[model samples]
Target: MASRILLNNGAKMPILGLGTWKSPPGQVTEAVKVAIDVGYRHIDCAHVYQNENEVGVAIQEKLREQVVKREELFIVSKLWCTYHEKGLVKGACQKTLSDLKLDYLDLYLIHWPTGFKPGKEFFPLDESGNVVPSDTNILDTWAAMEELVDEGLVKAIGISNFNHLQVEMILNKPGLKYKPAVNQIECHPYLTQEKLIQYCQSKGIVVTAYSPLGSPDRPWAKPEDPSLLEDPRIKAIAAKHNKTTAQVLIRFPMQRNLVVIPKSVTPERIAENFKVFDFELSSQDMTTLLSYNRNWRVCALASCTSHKDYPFHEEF
Candidate 1:
């Protein structure tokens, strides 16, 4: 079991989860099993990760062994941008469910606000290497998402990487059925995203933080990028509390009322991420950490940032 927060839709979402975005193939299966063994009930996943098949194997194995019941786990999956059309939404949701070997998902998120041309290529680009975006309106995509909830294909539907403005549009959509349950975003001390978090929470949308450790392993990361784990300030606080920098960074967003998911495949690191509940940061330490916000975003879709629905521009 893990700490949980009540969503606006009346579902209890575990505040700490395991992020499976960049997790490598062979290792993700073992990593997911290890995470469950260590009390991680919420498992964050997405179609673009291309590893749900492995994660599904682990979940099926765990259930077969009776380590946890189906209802005891909060499995999440996301709809990739390539599948954002009104008719394709259910297809994507069904594909994720079949891949995960689950009857239903506790949470399903629109991976990103930007819609790529609905096609086979995950990142469909033209000969010039520019993303071919879809004119698909989020209002339409969100309506399709609400349909999933009514059909019980998904328990809760939410959005990711959406700014307050995008969130508001969904909130105010005509004949809105279910509101967004959460917003998953790249968040850390360096990119605290305070206003978005505040706005989301104020509007009853839980914010789930991805890249809590600053995503040092991101494919786009350059050598010159600052590492949150290696930061002297974070390290100093970790030393003061006698905890690893991983724990400090993971706990930072949690303390600020956001659920934090730190990605890891190593056994010890996966176990360590769930150990956030053991320690608490001082208010001053939290203040110091919060001040480190440089508006430095790690997952800024460098070229894709030019998309019409690009998110970071709203606050970065």
Candidate 2:
């Protein structure tokens, strides 16, 4: 079983979860099934991933076979950008519920701070290829998220890709009903996010690291992009521990007490990723990994930079 961290709301989230972003639809179902079989209790998913239905098939099969129960798994899903309008929030969540075949989600997050025009298309762009922006305030969308918690559709609500200021805005809202229990962000040894992680910890918000393996397969990746798994510095640390580079990268975040969700479609790699719990990284090794931080981000949503609530403008 994976280790657990207590959220601000007093719920326990697994320290490691299976990330589903960028995972191909043809292989994702088997990946989910193998992950569950290999002892992964938490599965991180999102509406925009576009494979929740296949994930649902695996989840249902596991449950039907009594391999795992609904309550034992910490299933997380996110509200897509196109559904950020207050009026569209519940509908978006309901659609995810329908796709995942779940009565309720353990956690639900606003996928990003920037809002897009409400529509069937995930990325609603104009004739000029610029993303259309919604006039809806993010705070309003957050308020709608709280309603999901009240209605028992989601156990907790949080935000993803939100920087320090954006999180502060939610925390300092005059009549805020529920504080966000977590902040999911792109984090890895290359982008340690030291300041932001410390700030969120101070506010009692647990940080979840998405793209923990540097997302080498990210669609927009260029040929010159650095690979965390292939980095010699990371490989040296892994060699010290007699582990693979991927293992070292995953363990780096775990040492800092950050929740990590690394995606893998290969069954052997999926099983290997879960073997991290048996060993621990030393402080000196962790420090060496931190020194490699270049503030490198893999999932930079450049298209949304023009949005008013874009969170990456300020150095976090």
Candidate 3:
């Protein structure tokens, strides 16, 4: 059985989930099926991933095979930045639900604080290749998300890519009805985000770490970028534990009690990523890993920086 953590709202989320970001449609379905067979009960997806339909097919086949029931799994999806308008919120979530072929989402998140004008394109860009911004207030968008819970379309609502002050703005909203259950952010040894994780936990909000392997395969990666898996320090620690570097990276966040989602379409890698429950990292090793923090972000939305609500500006 997979380890589970209780969300503030009393829902149990698997400690480790399969992330679907950048997972190609051709391989994501098979990957999902294999992951489920390997005991992954949590699936992290987003409308922006552009492959929910494929993910839906895998889930449907699993249910048909009696491998797992709907209630036995946790399905998470995010609202795209294009649908931040309050009126467009429900429609955006419905599209994802329709694609995923699910009656309701286990958790739904605001993909980003920066919003784009409502449109068919995922990222409505300007002539200069910069992301176009919408005037929608994040609080207004969050209010709409609360309605999703009230309408029974989503069991829980949360935010992603939001910084401390941005989260505080939502938490301090005048008529806020629901507190964010989770804050999914890019976290690895390179960007430990200790203060951010502690702050979220202090408010009863869970933290989900994305790109825990340093996202070596990220599309925007340059040749000169550092590779976490290739780091000799991590490799040395892995050698001490008799595990792979990838295992050490995954275990880092798990040891910190943070939910982690690592994406991989390779069958063996998917299986390898899930076998982190057997080992414990030493306290000294954990601190040594912490020393590797360089505040490096693999998924920095550089184009969206000029947007008013762009996160990562504050020190956190």
Candidate 4:
């Protein structure tokens, strides 16, 4: 059975979700359906992921089969950087809703604090492969996100890839309608995000950890990049728990009371990722895990380095 955390807006979101980034369209549908059958109720998706249509197929099938009800499922999608302009936010959400075949999303997040040029291209890269940035105000984008909640297109609004100061900007925005329910960030033991998590939780914004397994599937990973799943220290913890390193990594955030979304295209791993509720990581295990924090971010959006709102420059 799925357990949930109360969002600041009074909505309940599952503590664990199936992350869909980099999950190929050819396999994501099966992966989603298998996760649903395996008792996963939350599915995290994004417009840039380019696989929402296939994910929708799996969701519709499960809903048709009565395996999951619309209310029982917590489907989430993000507002892409190109859609940060106030006028573009609603249309962007509509596109994701259309592709997901869902009338409403339980949660909708601003995918990144930075805005890219609004156009047909997802990245809108220049000749040098750098992102063409937009100067759209983050507060303006947040206003549009709040409007989605007002129109019932999204039950709650949240942020992703936003650092603490960026989140504070929204909180301090005048006439703020709804407080953000979650702040989904790139967090793993390597990039433990201790201060960011503390800040968000103190503000009553639930933190959703992405890249819990260090995103081994990330296309840019180099040969020398430290592998989180293969780290000898974490391997010892896994061996002690009789679990895969992935399970330990996924479970780490769960034990800290943060929502974790681990992506998987394989049925076995999808099930394995969700089999974490039964086990408990001891205090010593958690202490050792936290001490391994190297502040390493595997999903670093390197191209956005030139953007004014680039998040990684901040200490948190």
Give the alpha-carbon lDDT of every model.
0.91, 0.91, 0.92, 0.92
Q: Report RMSD (Å) for each prediction in the order shown.
A: 1.2, 1.2, 1.1, 1.2
TM-score of 1: 0.98
Model 4: CA > 4 A from native: none
lDDT by residue (175-199, candidate 2, tens digit) is 8999999999999888989999999
- For residues 189-262, what per-residue lDDT tens digits would candidate 4 score against the true structure? 88888899999999999999999999898999899888899999999999999999999999899888899999
Off by over 4 Å in 1: none
TM-score of each: 0.98, 0.98, 0.98, 0.98
Per-residue accuracy of model 3 over 1-316 as CA lDDT, tens digit each:
2499889889999999999988999999999999999999999999888999999999999999999999999999999999998889999899999999999999999988899988888878889888899999989999999999999999999999999999999999999999999999999999999999999989999999999998878889998988999999999999989999999999999888899999999999999999999988999999999999999988877678888988988997
Return the TM-score for candidate 2, rounded to 2 decimals. Answer: 0.98
Question: Which pairs of residues collide in candidate 4?
Answer: none
Off by over 4 Å in 2: none
User: How big is the positional error of residue 105 in model 2, measured in Å on the Cα after superposition?
Assistant: 0.2
Residue 87, candidate 4: alpha-carbon lDDT = 86
